[PDB]
Amino acid sequence: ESLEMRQMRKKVVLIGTGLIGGSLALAIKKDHDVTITGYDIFQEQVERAKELHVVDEIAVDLQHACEEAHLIVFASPVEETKKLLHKLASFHLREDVIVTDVGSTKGSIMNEAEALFSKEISFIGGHPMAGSHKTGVESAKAHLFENAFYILTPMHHVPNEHVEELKDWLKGTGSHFLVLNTEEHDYVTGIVSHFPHLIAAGLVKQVEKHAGDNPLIHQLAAGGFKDITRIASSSPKMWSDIVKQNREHLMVLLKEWISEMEDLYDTVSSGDAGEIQNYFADAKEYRDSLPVRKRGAIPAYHDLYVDVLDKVGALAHVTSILAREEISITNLQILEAREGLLGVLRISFQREEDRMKAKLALGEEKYQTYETI
Amino acid sequence: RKKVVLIGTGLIGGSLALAIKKDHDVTITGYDIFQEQVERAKELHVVDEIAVDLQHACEEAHLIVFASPVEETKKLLHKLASFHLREDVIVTDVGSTKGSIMNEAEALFSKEISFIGGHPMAGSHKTGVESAKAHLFENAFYILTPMHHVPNEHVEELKDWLKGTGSHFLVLNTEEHDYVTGIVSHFPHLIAAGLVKQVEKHAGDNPLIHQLAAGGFKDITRIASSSPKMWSDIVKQNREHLMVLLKEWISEMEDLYDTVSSGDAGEIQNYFADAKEYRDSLPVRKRGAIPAYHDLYVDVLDKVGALAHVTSILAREEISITNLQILEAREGLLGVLRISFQREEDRMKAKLALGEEKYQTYETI
Ligand SMILES: N[C@@H](Cc1ccc(O)cc1)C(=O)O
Ligand SMILES: N[C@@H](Cc1ccc(O)cc1)C(=O)O
């Protein structure tokens, strides 16, 4: 009754069948013929996942499904993930299995996995930099992580071939994979993600302190301030765990920050407009530079600068030209470079051939283009 | 026709001139430091005449509007105080701080002349008069700070002059204005720049910091792209308010350092919840002290022509885009393409047009 090919295809287990996990399942299915068996704490999400062909089967027996699996994917909250990794370490898994997770911090998970498997099993921590942690499987899409950074943190022993193999499993995501060591990941994300969270909340809180003394503050904090502070509305539970899990990195950062504010306090209070202006100019120069896609980093960036006018259809025209030439654009931005209605449009391409081609096509249409600034 | 003088014919000033003209039949004579901006303003019917003689134009004027940098404004106010102006004149400025300008005006005029400091809380991606528009300040707060003696009738008169802006006018005292804007606008600009600077410090030690720069970090620091010149003046002019704020902030960070280092997840959670609760309570889709981004996030697939399709749709609806980006670091942000608009009406319109073409879109809550 069942087809020999269906019986015999590879098998995946997904633990946590929500937005993130469901999306990963769709990206897997897109490029691999597999039986995905799914598991959730909430039985409605797995059943819906099944209905939506996000998973193939609902897991009766967790152990049976795991022991026959070529790939096991955790998309659960990090407490639950620890508890289930323990269970997994009790099981008799296949020799060739790959196990992976999703989480914003890596230190504690990886510390647990070295402690339970050592060198038996190929556990590779993961962090896809896209989407949301609580939202449903109805929203899951194969392209959710497309062109997003997806960090992989392999155990110390895992061969490079297994890391490449996992990249192949997730090929369908279209993510830019970076392989980092665990400390590297928590350090970087600490500076670049977690610490801003703290500062965002702080800003909001500072403003609320004063809002009782004039109600106008609540009115004037609409629009820009509210937009700036967006991340402060994220889950307090999730973020308190992140902060607890990356505590030491953040303590150090806060100490440097206090120090920076003390120097800023000296600059502001000295009242030297030249020094103040310098402080702002340094920040502007750097902030204007982002993305600063470096030469030997992943992925490569080949930029072209175009003189375009601030009018309806300017971008439509430029992008239609490029599309007609069958050139794919990796990024674009408007940089406001001087006065007047002109702006500079920066277009990024995947490789040098494509930039060259775009330069010619735009030139034949009487666009002025540049290589720098 | 009544006669208006505009001193500073750029985005802000030019826009004010257009809003005046919209509801009043007047001769607007313009003046600038840069002769090109005033000549362009004339070409564009933003001003009617280019001022030959500054004093002549000021002495016949019913309304005088300064839209210049606050240093130049002090210098020109001094000149004005030397002139023989009309009995009924109204004089007003545009400036992000009020303390120093008002202080100077009480010192030069005292109770003779009706000076009313002004602050329109709106801005733009551009700087020149070519970008000026009558509706620039529509539904924006526009603060008025009248001298101590100015009768309420003259404040109402000025509101009538500027009816065309569509702004919501608030009459504040000068200290109140600098205190509030200090908390709500200036101080965040300082913190934004500080964050950028903190991050750059570390970027030499790992280049991944440049690459992996998160969405949240980018968002809170977007304002760090504003004019360093303008902001350094603002900071110098509101120095004492900011020194106090920075001191409180240092203290807050020290308490946060205790909370984080104590490791109590309940207390940490409370800190975040307090911030969320408050932030969630702030008005939805209104204008405040920091110009908004008016961003729209769009779900698109990476294939040739994806951007072309989206921008064509928007252009056909005659919506002008201020910016756009493909986000590679977008945790918590559904939708890969971020489009920025000039104002809320345009974002709304773009959302409908894209929706009708079966694009999924998102907006931040
Ligand atoms: N407004 C243009 C894009 C643009 C924006 C700002 C500029 O400075 C230049 C061009 C469009 O809709 O296509
Ligand atoms: N490559 C698309 C734009 C795009 C880029 C990255 C994406 O993830 C999605 C869409 C174009 O050339 O129009």
Cα–Cα distance list, B79 to B60, B70, B73, B109 (Å):
15, 14, 10, 12
Residue A231 annotated as binding site: no
Q: Which helix (H) or strand (E) holds B251?
A: helix B239-262
Chain B environment of A262 (Cβ under 8 Å)? 250
Single-letter amino acid, residue A1: E
CB contact under 8 A, A184 and B208: yes
- Burial category of A260 from C-beta neighbours within 10 Å (exposed 0-12, middle 13-18, buried 19 and up): middle
Round to whole Å and give the CA distance between A98 and A10: 12
Cα–Cα distance list, B183 to A165, A358, B224 (Å):
53, 47, 17
Which atom of ligand 2 is nearest to A143's Cα? 8
CB contact under 8 A, A230 and B217: no
- In the 8-state DSSP scheme, what is residue B223? G
Round to whole Å and give the CA distance between A76 and A111: 17
Which atom of ligand 2 is nearest to B301's Cα? 9
Please, what is the end-to-end C-alpha distance for chain B in angstroms? Answer: 49
Q: Which helix (H) or strand (E) holds B5?
A: strand B2-7
Cα distance from A42 to chain B (closest Cα, Å)? 22
Single-letter amino acid, residue B128: G
Round to whole Å and give the CA distance between B352 and B359: 10
How many other CB atoms are found less than 10 A from the CB of residue B316? 12
Instruction: Evaluate whether A150 touches A126 at the Cβ level (below 8 Å).
Output: yes
Instruction: Evaluate whether A97 touches A71 at the Cβ level (below 8 Å).
Output: yes
Round to whole Å and give the CA distance between B22 and B12: 15
Q: Which helix (H) or strand (E) holds B254?
A: helix B239-262
Q: Is the CB of B312 under 6 A from ligand 2?
A: no
Structure tokens at B354: 């894209």
Q: How many helices (H) and strands (E) does chain B have?
A: 15, 13
Cα distance from B3 to chain A (closest Cα, Å)? 28
Q: Is the CB of B328 under 6 A from ligand 2?
A: no
Q: Which residues 6+ apart lie within 8 Å of A51 measured at CB?
A: none
* Closest C-alpha residue for ligand 2 atom 4: B302
Q: Is the CB of A343 under 6 A from ligand 1?
A: yes
Q: Is the CB of A310 under 6 A from ligand 1?
A: yes
Instruction: Evaluate whether A187 touches B206 at the Cβ level (below 8 Å).
Output: yes
Strand partners, A58: A38
φ/ψ bin of B156: left (φ > 0), alpha (ψ from -120 to 50), beta (otherwise): alpha
Ligand 1: which of A306, A312, A315 to mutate, judged by most atoms within 8 Å of the beta carbon? A315
Which atom of ligand 2 is nearest to A331's Cα? 5
Annotated binding-site residue numbers of B for NAD(+): 11-12, 32, 68, 72, 96, 124, 128
Residue whose pair of structure tokens reads 């962090």 in the numeric block: A127
Q: Which helix (H) or strand (E) holds A349?
A: strand A342-349
Q: Which helix (H) or strand (E) holds B141?
A: strand B141-146
Q: Is the CB of A334 under 6 A from ligand 1?
A: yes
Instruction: Evaluate whether A121 touches A97 at the Cβ level (below 8 Å).
Output: yes
Q: Is the CB of A264 under 6 A from ligand 1?
A: no
Structure tokens at A125: 């921590």
For residue A180, how far is its CA from the centre of ligand 2 (angstroms)? Answer: 26
Q: Is the CB of B327 under 6 A from ligand 2?
A: no
* Closest C-alpha residue for ligand 1 atom 6: A310
Chain A environment of B283 (Cβ under 8 Å)? 218-219, 222, 226
Q: Point out the residue among B232, B254, B274 whose CB comes nearest to the CB of A205.
A: B274
Q: What is the CA radius of gyration of chain B?
A: 23
Cα distance from B214 to chain A (closest Cα, Å)? 5
Closest-CA residue of chain A to B346: A312
Cα–Cα distance list, B278 to A222, B153, B256, B266, B325 (Å):
12, 38, 18, 18, 29
CB contact under 8 A, B332 and A234: yes
Q: Point out the residue among A188, A313, A322 whose CB comes nearest to the CB of B208.
A: A188
Instruction: Evaluate whether A141 touches A23 at the Cβ level (below 8 Å).
Output: yes
Q: Which helix (H) or strand (E) holds B108?
A: helix B99-108
Experimental method: X-ray
Chain B environment of A341 (Cβ under 8 Å)? 126, 128, 130-131
Round to whole Å and give the CA distance between A338 and B174: 34
